[PDB]
Amino acid sequence: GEIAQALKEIAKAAAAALKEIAWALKEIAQALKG
Amino acid sequence: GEIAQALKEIAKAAAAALKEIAWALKEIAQALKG
Amino acid sequence: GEIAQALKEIAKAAAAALKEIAWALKEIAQALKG
Amino acid sequence: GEIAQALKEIAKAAAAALKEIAWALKEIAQALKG
Amino acid sequence: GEIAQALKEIAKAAAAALKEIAWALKEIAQALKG
Amino acid sequence: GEIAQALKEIAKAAAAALKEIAWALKEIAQALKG
Amino acid sequence: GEIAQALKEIAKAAAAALKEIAWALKEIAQALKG
Amino acid sequence: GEIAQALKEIAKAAAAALKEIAWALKEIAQALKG
Amino acid sequence: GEIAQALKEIAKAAAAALKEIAWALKEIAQALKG
Amino acid sequence: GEIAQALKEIAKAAAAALKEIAWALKEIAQALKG
Amino acid sequence: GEIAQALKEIAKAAAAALKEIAWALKEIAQALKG
Amino acid sequence: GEIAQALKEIAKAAAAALKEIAWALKEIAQALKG
Amino acid sequence: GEIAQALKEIAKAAAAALKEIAWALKEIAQALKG
Amino acid sequence: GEIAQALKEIAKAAAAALKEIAWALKEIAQALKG
Ligand SMILES: [N+]
Ligand SMILES: [N+]
Ligand code: NA
Ligand code: NA
Ligand code: NA
Ligand code: NA
């Protein structure tokens, strides 16, 4: 159904963008170690 | 449908804004490297 | 519809506030670079 | 309707709390300036 | 209704946890001030 | 109902994980203190 | 049902990604501790 | 809410029209009873 | 909830009007019995 | 909203067609009266 | 869930009242014998 | 949306079938006149 | 899903009861024929 | 979606059953002519 599919698009989009934040934070950690 | 369309707008707008956060965090990492 | 309108309000409000977070993170990067 | 009103409450509660985060990040930037 | 009540629970739980993030960020600012 | 229960799961899961973020931020504050 | 399942997927995907953020912040704390 | 109000409109319109059918059938009974 | 209450109103209104139809048909049967 | 509007269309269409049934029953009563 | 239970009530109430119509029609059939 | 469309299908299918009942009732009235 | 299943129960229950009405009308026809 | 499919099932089942009622009524008309 179109509603369920849109809800899955939220899951996917939100998760992917949150993981980008996590990767940027690892970059902060590497900068601090360097 | 309109509910599905609005849900997709949440996915798009939240993802885009979270990616702006990720980018600002990379700016912080770059400042910490020097 | 009213449910679709309220979902759009979530999209707008969340995106705007997340962008304020990104802008604040940029302020942190500026402070580190000064 | 009650579902739309609860969604609006999500929009309001989330936005207010995310702006609290933005403000705390401004406090970090201010701490770094000082 | 139960859907509305569950949405209000999202609002309440998310806002409270986001405020805990804001507080922890204030603790970072305070550590930097010291 | 199953939709209400799934919303409650969003509330519980999101709140728990956001609290994990708050705790990790407090560890950052502690590291800055020491 | 499919809407309930999609909502559970939001819960799981968001909680997992938020946990990755928390871990990355622990990594920053470790970097700051030396 | 708008969905609830539309459902109430189904209840009202359907009941009123079904009552018209019952009245018409009473007219039939009256015609048979001469 | 308001949607469930409106659906219950459909059930109640439709059943009561359908029973008026059944009653009018009984009246026809009795007119035909003489 | 489109769901409310569709529900209103059910109310209108069903009511109108049930009234056509009631009218046809009145025609039976008329035929029985000569 | 309360919406599902209300829909089941429509099913039950409408079916019971329609069966009352069927019984009344059988009474007409018996009167015509007859 | 698909739910709205399926609701419009109920309105259409129900109204058409109910009109067939009304025509069949007119055929009874006609038979009674002869 | 439970809502979809409840809607299917409406379809089944109403169709079966309406077919009982059709059968009783066939019994009226037979009584007239005899 | 499953909800839209179940609504379509109501449309189909209800139409088919109502047509059976129309056909039985025409049998009554024919019995009356005979
Ligand atoms: N801000
Ligand atoms: N027949
Ligand atoms: Na849908
Ligand atoms: Na500042
Ligand atoms: Na569903
Ligand atoms: Na750590």
Side-chain angles (χ1 to χ4, degrees), chain A residues 1-32 34, chain B, chain C, chain D, chain E, chain F, chain G, chain H, chain I, chain J, chain K, chain L residues 1-26 28-34, chain M residues 1-32 34, chain N residues 1-32 34:
Chain A
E2 61 176 347
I3 290 167
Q5 292 331 288
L7 290 171
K8 285 175 181 310
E9 181 60 32
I10 295 173
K12 177 181 170 196
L18 290 166
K19 284 177 182 161
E20 299 190 41
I21 291 174
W23 306 342
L25 294 166
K26 293 178 181 295
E27 291 180 58
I28 289 173
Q30 297 195 134
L32 286 166
Chain B
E2 65 183 335
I3 293 169
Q5 285 173 354
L7 290 166
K8 285 170 158 173
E9 181 56 30
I10 294 176
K12 178 183 175 184
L18 290 165
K19 285 170 174 182
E20 295 187 33
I21 293 173
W23 180 251
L25 291 166
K26 292 170 173 280
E27 189 182 347
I28 293 168
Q30 183 65 41
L32 289 167
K33 291 175 199 170
Chain C
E2 72 183 331
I3 291 175
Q5 285 178 171
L7 289 169
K8 285 175 162 173
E9 183 54 44
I10 292 172
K12 180 182 183 183
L18 290 168
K19 293 172 181 186
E20 290 180 41
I21 290 171
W23 305 340
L25 288 163
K26 290 184 191 283
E27 292 188 65
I28 292 169
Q30 287 302 317
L32 289 167
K33 295 171 197 300
Chain D
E2 62 186 333
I3 290 165
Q5 296 332 293
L7 290 166
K8 289 171 171 177
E9 184 52 53
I10 294 173
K12 179 175 167 185
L18 292 168
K19 289 167 179 166
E20 290 191 46
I21 289 171
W23 179 253
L25 293 165
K26 292 175 177 274
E27 299 181 276
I28 295 173
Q30 184 67 15
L32 292 167
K33 288 173 223 184
Chain E
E2 67 186 346
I3 290 167
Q5 294 329 291
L7 295 165
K8 285 179 191 306
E9 187 48 38
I10 293 171
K12 180 181 178 189
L18 289 168
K19 281 171 199 169
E20 293 193 38
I21 291 166
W23 181 259
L25 296 163
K26 291 176 182 285
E27 294 272 16
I28 294 172
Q30 187 71 7
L32 289 169
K33 290 185 198 156
Chain F
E2 68 180 339
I3 292 171
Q5 296 329 291
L7 291 168
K8 283 184 164 176
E9 185 46 43
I10 293 171
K12 176 182 184 199
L18 287 167
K19 285 179 185 53
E20 294 190 39
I21 292 171
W23 302 339
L25 289 163
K26 286 174 176 190
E27 294 189 55
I28 295 175
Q30 288 299 307
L32 289 164
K33 279 275 166 198
Chain G
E2 60 183 342
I3 288 168
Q5 291 335 109
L7 291 169
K8 281 174 170 158
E9 185 50 45
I10 296 173
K12 182 186 170 197
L18 291 169
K19 283 170 177 169
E20 296 192 18
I21 291 172
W23 184 254
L25 294 162
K26 287 181 156 162
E27 286 197 51
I28 296 171
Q30 182 70 20
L32 285 171
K33 285 183 196 185
Chain H
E2 56 182 355
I3 293 169
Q5 300 329 297
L7 290 168
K8 284 170 159 180
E9 183 51 43
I10 294 170
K12 176 181 174 186
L18 291 165
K19 289 167 170 166
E20 289 193 28
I21 292 174
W23 304 343
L25 289 163
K26 290 174 184 288
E27 286 188 50
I28 291 167
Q30 292 309 322
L32 289 166
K33 290 177 190 184
Chain I
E2 64 182 344
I3 294 167
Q5 294 333 283
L7 290 168
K8 277 169 176 183
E9 180 56 42
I10 293 171
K12 174 178 178 197
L18 289 167
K19 285 173 178 170
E20 298 190 37
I21 295 174
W23 183 254
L25 290 166
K26 284 174 151 288
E27 188 171 7
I28 296 174
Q30 223 267 6
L32 288 170
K33 281 277 206 269
Chain J
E2 62 191 337
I3 294 173
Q5 298 332 295
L7 290 169
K8 287 179 164 169
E9 186 52 55
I10 292 169
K12 174 186 176 171
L18 287 170
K19 286 178 192 199
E20 295 190 43
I21 293 176
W23 185 255
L25 292 166
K26 288 167 90 79
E27 207 174 321
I28 294 170
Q30 178 73 13
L32 289 161
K33 283 190 293 175
Chain K
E2 69 179 331
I3 297 175
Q5 298 327 293
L7 291 166
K8 285 175 158 170
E9 180 56 31
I10 295 177
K12 178 184 173 193
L18 287 169
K19 285 172 186 281
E20 301 189 40
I21 293 172
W23 176 253
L25 296 163
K26 284 170 199 286
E27 297 179 36
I28 293 171
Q30 293 167 335
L32 292 163
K33 293 167 227 157
Chain L
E2 65 183 337
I3 295 170
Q5 295 332 280
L7 292 165
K8 284 175 191 310
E9 184 52 39
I10 293 173
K12 180 183 190 177
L18 292 167
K19 284 170 169 176
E20 291 185 56
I21 292 174
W23 181 259
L25 293 166
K26 287 172 170 297
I28 294 174
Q30 182 59 24
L32 289 166
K33 292 176 180 177
Chain M
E2 64 186 332
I3 288 164
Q5 298 328 287
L7 290 165
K8 281 178 169 166
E9 190 43 51
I10 293 169
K12 185 190 177 195
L18 288 167
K19 284 160 195 302
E20 297 193 23
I21 288 170
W23 183 257
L25 289 166
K26 288 175 178 290
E27 290 182 284
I28 292 172
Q30 187 66 5
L32 291 166
Chain N
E2 60 181 347
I3 294 176
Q5 300 333 108
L7 291 168
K8 283 172 177 166
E9 178 57 40
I10 290 173
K12 177 185 180 197
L18 289 168
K19 287 183 178 155
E20 290 280 341
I21 289 168
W23 298 335
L25 291 164
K26 288 175 163 276
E27 296 187 61
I28 292 171
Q30 289 295 329
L32 286 165

